[PDB]
């Protein structure tokens, strides 16, 4: 194959240069499990037992015993497949555009296949990370003109049946009001018996800067960040708490546990960018190529994610 | 007035964000391109880049050329120019096109998605009769006199 | 069956694709091994 | 089209209301780690206490007699069981299988303890209950002796489950 | 119960009537050994004659524009194709993936030959046809040039398929 398909050989050499996604930091190693498909749906069944009555004493002779029931729930996860096309130079045509310092046509914005693929892969990965955190696909900084997606395709920010808190516009700078809502949201969380788990916090940089201020007269030797860490530790049974900063978020705080039993990420094994065998070729030096990637595979339990939105109006 | 800016830049580019990084005049071709599209090239008179073109005939010694124009003489839409050879890449009016095109600097604020567009005498799109063009976005200003817009052209109308 | 192995030689596009997914998985495993919070 | 989809969802919900274990696809996992009050559901088949020497009979049924008192109805096909009470009561349906349309029923000669459908929420503990014409338990001329162990618990708009022990017929 | 099941059947039939390939399980196989007149079906996607160099565009759709003329409607989400005609005609829908809810459209700049939905059974061969507001073809303000090749064929109460060739716009 590598003796026949130059483009396949080029991708194999250049695949190591693509950087790992930042979404890996948002999840524990145990929370991510690969599945095997490209487009469609999968079903997961969770079995739970229950006690139907008080236990019975084993005294003398008896044959009437209490019963233990069972029940199951099924959750359907929708996946999707998307593709992008990019132009580049034909392999035989590179030698006629090689220069002493670079290869390519500067005037017409044409690259060798290896360079174009690496840049195109990086752009796709950024869009992948945006969807995982936000649940939406868009290329506008305004966030409008979103691509309509399938049902049962949610991200962390748009997962339904989760706790959402809104900070009023007038209190957007009042850190005390912000912490008031967070505590209320932390109260409404329902972790069941899995509360003894590490937690993860994601904040936009603007909120991150507000946190590093000294904790409020005023005090010292303590920051708003540490106050948040203690408050979260009150509900996770004094477990570890991690904080991360993502430029993708805007005036929003995300809190969710790091227990696979509550939130699990099950993406396709072909989610990351993958080259396509179809390569358009003409009489000129311009060729076209396609890259494929798969979206979907986030599963979470009801009322286990806290979403604080700071209204900047 | 050029595919690539004539003046150099004193600054490197920041390749961090991925949103709204395509509203540049150097963006050639169409946003969505079909592999079964018919692509022509012609000698270029003037700079018809990102504009509707019409056939231009000289005395007869030289072959015909394409110049920015519209109205009853619209032949296609120019989507690329090679400056070294002066060859203008033209997509015929009989072929569907979707991309960023020059917009008239008059009432550009009034252009909204879903508005009917027609080419003027200078190959610039304007809000409306004979050409089926619909704006898909709002006017993006790249220069004090240069406005581009996402529009789809799908042939002539009755 | 990963692109990291130089001895590996795919025979067709399908094996090439499977090697890519294996290569991505190994990198994800390697990242979590070297991740410290 | 969308209106047809909405009407289809409405009728599907109405049909699934009268079902033992309706199959639904949900986007999230419901969490019920608390082990208390996890047994009062419409899919809890059988009884709270079950003996190895209990007599179980499977019969074809008409309607939905699940968790209701049943009576034999003779019509050509074999006789079936229909939800009903009064003096015609033959047994109580404790399980159902919709694929084969077969109801598993305990005869009236065998005592039972479990959750059954009640007419309304006016039933308290230590109350004498009678099966009505629809096979639902209503507060009290009782041919059988059924006493409520708990109070009526509501799950759906009309679903009322009450824990009752039935131990034969009166005189 | 029984009334609910009947309403479920009626709603399911009405919904699946407006479907390209509704999934109906049958108790027995059908006989179609004759090789003639097997192409007049609602699930016969694509066109009678298709060129390798045809242009296909996939867009999200609202409603059910299958085998109908489509227009572009811009709303926040991306623009979507909706069943409509008149002077707003952008193309014709030739296929729909219901899982992704994505419709495939051939632009009006391309010529097509295939079966399309007609307004009623009043269409004869060699007739000029116009797309109505609903994206259905009606007998003749013909901004486009479409000619019927066969007569209107009936599959259902409102399903009328007619073989038409559309080759651009008039002047």
Tab-separated table of N, CA, C and O in Angstrom, chain D residues 69-117:
chain	number	residue	atom	x	y	z
D	69	UNK	N	-58.081	-8.133	40.074
D	69	UNK	CA	-58.836	-9.362	40.239
D	69	UNK	C	-59.475	-9.787	38.927
D	69	UNK	O	-60.008	-8.973	38.176
D	70	UNK	N	-59.426	-11.090	38.659
D	70	UNK	CA	-59.843	-11.626	37.374
D	70	UNK	C	-60.973	-12.628	37.580
D	70	UNK	O	-61.129	-13.223	38.649
D	71	UNK	N	-61.766	-12.804	36.526
D	71	UNK	CA	-62.868	-13.754	36.519
D	71	UNK	C	-62.880	-14.495	35.190
D	71	UNK	O	-62.521	-13.938	34.150
D	72	UNK	N	-63.291	-15.759	35.237
D	72	UNK	CA	-63.341	-16.575	34.031
D	72	UNK	C	-64.534	-16.184	33.170
D	72	UNK	O	-65.652	-16.022	33.670
D	73	UNK	N	-64.293	-16.029	31.871
D	73	UNK	CA	-65.328	-15.706	30.898
D	73	UNK	C	-65.290	-16.755	29.796
D	73	UNK	O	-64.236	-16.992	29.193
D	74	UNK	N	-66.439	-17.374	29.535
D	74	UNK	CA	-66.578	-18.419	28.529
D	74	UNK	C	-67.364	-17.850	27.355
D	74	UNK	O	-68.429	-17.252	27.545
D	75	UNK	N	-66.836	-18.033	26.147
D	75	UNK	CA	-67.492	-17.543	24.942
D	75	UNK	C	-68.803	-18.282	24.685
D	75	UNK	O	-69.360	-18.217	23.588
D	76	UNK	N	-64.853	-20.993	17.784
D	76	UNK	CA	-64.955	-21.072	19.236
D	76	UNK	C	-63.585	-21.319	19.858
D	76	UNK	O	-62.815	-22.152	19.378
D	77	UNK	N	-63.286	-20.588	20.927
D	77	UNK	CA	-62.000	-20.659	21.603
D	77	UNK	C	-62.190	-21.025	23.069
D	77	UNK	O	-63.310	-21.092	23.582
D	78	UNK	N	-61.066	-21.266	23.739
D	78	UNK	CA	-61.075	-21.605	25.149
D	78	UNK	C	-61.493	-20.396	25.986
D	78	UNK	O	-61.348	-19.251	25.556
D	79	UNK	N	-62.025	-20.631	27.187
D	79	UNK	CA	-62.388	-19.508	28.059
D	79	UNK	C	-61.163	-18.709	28.476
D	79	UNK	O	-60.055	-19.238	28.592
D	80	UNK	N	-61.377	-17.418	28.706
D	80	UNK	CA	-60.304	-16.498	29.056
D	80	UNK	C	-60.572	-15.897	30.436
D	80	UNK	O	-61.522	-16.273	31.125
D	81	UNK	N	-59.722	-14.954	30.836
D	81	UNK	CA	-59.857	-14.257	32.110
D	81	UNK	C	-59.995	-12.768	31.831
D	81	UNK	O	-59.227	-12.203	31.042
D	82	UNK	N	-60.981	-12.140	32.462
D	82	UNK	CA	-61.261	-10.723	32.287
D	82	UNK	C	-61.255	-10.035	33.644
D	82	UNK	O	-61.691	-10.614	34.643
D	83	UNK	N	-60.746	-8.805	33.678
D	83	UNK	CA	-60.682	-8.051	34.922
D	83	UNK	C	-62.084	-7.789	35.460
D	83	UNK	O	-62.893	-7.117	34.815
D	84	UNK	N	-62.364	-8.322	36.643
D	84	UNK	CA	-63.656	-8.136	37.271
D	84	UNK	C	-63.634	-8.654	38.689
D	84	UNK	O	-62.731	-9.400	39.085
D	85	UNK	N	-64.642	-8.244	39.453
D	85	UNK	CA	-64.751	-8.661	40.837
D	85	UNK	C	-66.133	-9.156	41.209
D	85	UNK	O	-66.706	-9.998	40.512
D	86	UNK	N	-66.678	-8.635	42.305
D	86	UNK	CA	-67.986	-9.060	42.760
D	86	UNK	C	-67.982	-10.510	43.205
D	86	UNK	O	-66.991	-11.033	43.726
D	87	UNK	N	-69.117	-11.174	42.993
D	87	UNK	CA	-69.256	-12.579	43.350
D	87	UNK	C	-68.659	-13.517	42.310
D	87	UNK	O	-68.590	-14.725	42.556
D	88	UNK	N	-68.232	-12.996	41.163
D	88	UNK	CA	-67.697	-13.811	40.084
D	88	UNK	C	-66.181	-13.947	40.135
D	88	UNK	O	-65.597	-14.529	39.216
D	89	UNK	N	-65.537	-13.425	41.175
D	89	UNK	CA	-64.080	-13.424	41.235
D	89	UNK	C	-63.536	-14.847	41.276
D	89	UNK	O	-63.964	-15.669	42.091
D	90	UNK	N	-62.587	-15.132	40.387
D	90	UNK	CA	-61.894	-16.413	40.343
D	90	UNK	C	-60.489	-16.341	40.921
D	90	UNK	O	-60.060	-17.266	41.619
D	91	UNK	N	-59.768	-15.267	40.649
D	91	UNK	CA	-58.429	-15.118	41.168
D	91	UNK	C	-57.934	-13.705	40.981
D	91	UNK	O	-58.709	-12.791	40.696
D	92	UNK	N	-56.625	-13.533	41.141
D	92	UNK	CA	-55.983	-12.234	40.990
D	92	UNK	C	-54.775	-12.393	40.078
D	92	UNK	O	-53.965	-13.309	40.261
D	93	UNK	N	-54.658	-11.504	39.095
D	93	UNK	CA	-53.562	-11.560	38.139
D	93	UNK	C	-52.329	-10.898	38.741
D	93	UNK	O	-52.339	-9.697	39.027
D	94	UNK	N	-51.267	-11.681	38.931
D	94	UNK	CA	-50.040	-11.159	39.518
D	94	UNK	C	-48.940	-10.932	38.488
D	94	UNK	O	-47.978	-10.206	38.781
D	95	UNK	N	-49.042	-11.528	37.301
D	95	UNK	CA	-48.027	-11.314	36.281
D	95	UNK	C	-48.690	-11.331	34.913
D	95	UNK	O	-49.792	-11.853	34.747
D	96	UNK	N	-47.997	-10.771	33.924
D	96	UNK	CA	-48.535	-10.694	32.573
D	96	UNK	C	-47.392	-10.824	31.578
D	96	UNK	O	-46.248	-10.460	31.864
D	97	UNK	N	-47.708	-11.378	30.409
D	97	UNK	CA	-46.780	-11.474	29.287
D	97	UNK	C	-47.544	-11.060	28.040
D	97	UNK	O	-48.456	-11.772	27.602
D	98	UNK	N	-47.177	-9.907	27.477
D	98	UNK	CA	-47.927	-9.335	26.365
D	98	UNK	C	-47.587	-9.989	25.033
D	98	UNK	O	-48.416	-9.969	24.115
D	99	UNK	N	-46.386	-10.555	24.896
D	99	UNK	CA	-46.032	-11.234	23.653
D	99	UNK	C	-46.945	-12.425	23.400
D	99	UNK	O	-47.521	-12.564	22.315
D	100	UNK	N	-47.090	-13.296	24.393
D	100	UNK	CA	-47.974	-14.446	24.285
D	100	UNK	C	-49.386	-14.141	24.759
D	100	UNK	O	-50.258	-15.008	24.652
D	101	UNK	N	-49.628	-12.930	25.254
D	101	UNK	CA	-50.920	-12.533	25.811
D	101	UNK	C	-51.402	-13.561	26.832
D	101	UNK	O	-52.484	-14.141	26.719
D	102	UNK	N	-50.565	-13.795	27.839
D	102	UNK	CA	-50.850	-14.767	28.889
D	102	UNK	C	-50.694	-14.111	30.251
D	102	UNK	O	-49.659	-13.498	30.534
D	103	UNK	N	-51.706	-14.256	31.097
D	103	UNK	CA	-51.693	-13.697	32.441
D	103	UNK	C	-51.444	-14.807	33.453
D	103	UNK	O	-52.124	-15.839	33.430
D	104	UNK	N	-50.455	-14.596	34.319
D	104	UNK	CA	-50.171	-15.491	35.431
D	104	UNK	C	-50.962	-15.035	36.649
D	104	UNK	O	-50.843	-13.881	37.081
D	105	UNK	N	-51.744	-15.958	37.209
D	105	UNK	CA	-52.808	-15.662	38.155
D	105	UNK	C	-52.695	-16.614	39.338
D	105	UNK	O	-52.369	-17.796	39.169
D	106	UNK	N	-52.953	-16.094	40.529
D	106	UNK	CA	-53.041	-16.895	41.749
D	106	UNK	C	-54.514	-17.170	42.029
D	106	UNK	O	-55.317	-16.225	42.031
D	107	UNK	N	-54.909	-18.421	42.257
D	107	UNK	CA	-56.315	-18.710	42.550
D	107	UNK	C	-56.751	-18.087	43.867
D	107	UNK	O	-55.944	-17.819	44.759
D	108	UNK	N	-58.061	-17.856	43.979
D	108	UNK	CA	-58.623	-17.272	45.191
D	108	UNK	C	-58.425	-18.182	46.397
D	108	UNK	O	-58.431	-17.708	47.537
D	109	UNK	N	-58.238	-19.484	46.173
D	109	UNK	CA	-58.005	-20.416	47.267
D	109	UNK	C	-56.612	-20.285	47.871
D	109	UNK	O	-56.350	-20.894	48.914
D	110	UNK	N	-55.720	-19.523	47.247
D	110	UNK	CA	-54.362	-19.327	47.737
D	110	UNK	C	-54.201	-17.887	48.202
D	110	UNK	O	-54.564	-16.953	47.479
D	111	UNK	N	-53.662	-17.711	49.406
D	111	UNK	CA	-53.493	-16.381	49.969
D	111	UNK	C	-52.336	-15.653	49.294
D	111	UNK	O	-51.360	-16.262	48.848
D	112	UNK	N	-52.459	-14.330	49.229
D	112	UNK	CA	-51.498	-13.485	48.538
D	112	UNK	C	-51.240	-12.227	49.355
D	112	UNK	O	-52.101	-11.776	50.113
D	113	UNK	N	-50.040	-11.673	49.196
D	113	UNK	CA	-49.663	-10.402	49.812
D	113	UNK	C	-48.889	-9.603	48.774
D	113	UNK	O	-47.794	-10.010	48.376
D	114	UNK	N	-49.439	-8.478	48.335
D	114	UNK	CA	-48.737	-7.704	47.326
D	114	UNK	C	-49.473	-6.427	46.990
D	114	UNK	O	-50.513	-6.106	47.569
D	115	UNK	N	-48.909	-5.697	46.031
D	115	UNK	CA	-49.460	-4.418	45.607
D	115	UNK	C	-50.490	-4.631	44.507
D	115	UNK	O	-50.211	-5.300	43.507
D	116	UNK	N	-51.673	-4.053	44.692
D	116	UNK	CA	-52.771	-4.188	43.750
D	116	UNK	C	-53.370	-2.820	43.449
D	116	UNK	O	-53.171	-1.851	44.189
D	117	UNK	N	-54.105	-2.761	42.339
D	117	UNK	CA	-54.717	-1.516	41.894
D	117	UNK	C	-55.909	-1.176	42.775
D	117	UNK	O	-56.756	-2.029	43.071
